[PDB]
C-alpha cells in the first residue's frame, strides 16, 4: 500500500516534470512517505523511476492480458480485434493518465532504465502482435513485412492515446472517439493493409 502509493504519486510527478526535474523530497511530500521507506522499497530514486516506467508500460496494456487473448480460441483476426479493443478502450476509460506521458518522456531522453522496459515489456508485447500479423499474412513473425506491419497497426492507437485532445478539437474537428467506430475502422483498415503487403511479400518469395 505504501509501495503502491509511492509508485502512483511518483508516476504523476515524473509525468508532469520528468525525471531530471523531480526531487526525492517532492516524491516524499506528494506520497507522504519517508525517504527510508522509499529507500527500503525501491533502493533509490533510479530504482523507483525504473518501477514507475515498468508500471506505466503495464497500465498501457498488461502482458498477461495479451497472453490470455493470444491463447484463447479464435482466428488471429478476432485476436487482433481484441488487442486493438484493449488500446481503444484505454482511450475511453483513462484519457487523463500519467502512464503514456512518462513513457513518451522516456522515449525522447532515454535513461539507463529504458533498455529494461524495452526488453521486459515492449519486446514481448510487440512479439504477440507480430505473431498475430504473421498468422494473418502467412509470414514469419520476424519477416521484414511483419516488423513494418506492427508499426502500421500499433502506431494509430498510440497517436490517439497521446494526441486525442488536440486532434479532436483543432486538427481533425469532427473526429468521434466512440470506441466501436474506431475499432471497426482500425480492424477493416489493418486487414486491408496486411492483405496488400502480404501479396507483395509472397511475390518477392
| DSSP per-residue codes, 60-77 | H--HHHHHHHHHSSS-HH
User: Could you give the string, one character per residue 42-71, with x where binding to ligand ZHG holds by CB under 6 A and - elsewhere?
Assistant: ------------------xx----------
Contact between 186 and ligand ZHG (CB under 6 A)? no
Rounded CA separation 116/102 (Å):
15
Residue 173 CB, nearest approach to ligand ZHG (Å): 11
3-state SS record for 7-57: HHHHHHHHHHHCCCCCCHHHHHHHHCCCHHHHHHHHCCHHHHHHHHHHHHH
CA pseudo-torsion sign 90, 130, 62, 106: negative
Interface with ligand ZHG (CB under 6 A), residue from 125, 136, 161, 190: 125
Contact between 117 and ligand ZHG (CB under 6 A)? no
Contact between 107 and ligand ZHG (CB under 6 A)? no
Residue 73 CB, nearest approach to a second copy (Å): 25
**Residue placing its CB nearer to a second copy in the complex, 32 or 115:** 115
Q: Give the footprint of a second copy on this chain (CB under 8 A).
A: 15-18, 20-21, 101, 104-105, 107-110, 114-115, 118-119, 122-123, 126, 130, 142, 144-145, 147-152, 154-156, 158-160, 162-163, 166-167, 169-172, 174-176, 181-182, 184-186, 188-197, 199-200
Question: Grid coordinates standing for 198?
Answer: 502480404
Under 8 Å CB-to-CB from 145, ≥6 apart: which residues? 137, 139, 197, 198, 200, 201
Contact set with ligand ZHG (CB under 6 A): 60-61, 122, 125-126, 129, 150, 154, 167, 171-172
Amino acid at each position: 500500500a505504501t509501495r503502491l502509493q509511492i509508485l502512483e504519486k511518483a508516476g504523476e510527478l515524473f509525468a508532469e516534470q520528468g525525471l531530471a526535474n523531480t526531487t526525492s523530497k517532492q516524491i516524499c511530500e506528494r506520497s507522504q512517505a519517508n525517504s527510508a521507506a522509499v529507500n527500503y522499497h525501491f533502493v533509490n530514486k533510479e530504482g523507483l523511476y525504473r518501477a514507475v516506467l515498468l508500471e506505466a508500460h503495464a497500465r498501457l496494456v498488461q502482458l498477461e492480458t495479451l497472453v490470455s487473448l493470444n491463447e484463447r480460441p479464435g482466428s488471429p483476426q478476432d485476436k487482433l480485434r481484441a488487442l486493438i479493443t484493449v488500446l481503444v478502450e484505454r482511450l475511453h476509460n483513462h484519457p487523463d493518465g500519467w502512464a503514456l506521458k512518462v513513457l513518451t518522456r522516456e522515449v525522447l531522453s532515454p535513461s539507463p532504465e529504458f533498455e529494461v522496459v524495452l526488453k521486459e515489456q515492449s519486446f514481448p508485447k510487440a512479439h504477440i502482435l507480430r505473431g498475430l500479423l504473421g498468422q494473418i499474412m502467412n509470414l514469419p513473425a520476424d519477416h521484414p513485412t511483419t516488423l513494418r506491419s506492427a508499426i502500421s497497426v500499433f502506431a494509430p492507437c498510440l497517436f490517439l492515446l497521446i494526441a486525442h485532445q488536440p486532434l479532436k478539437q483543432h486538427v481533425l474537428q469532427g473526429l468521434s472517439l466512440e470506441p466501436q467506430g474506431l475499432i471497426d475502422h482500425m480492424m477493416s483498415y489493418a486487414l486491408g493493409g496486411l492483405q496488400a503487403v502480404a501479396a507483395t511479400a509472397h511475390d518477392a518469395a
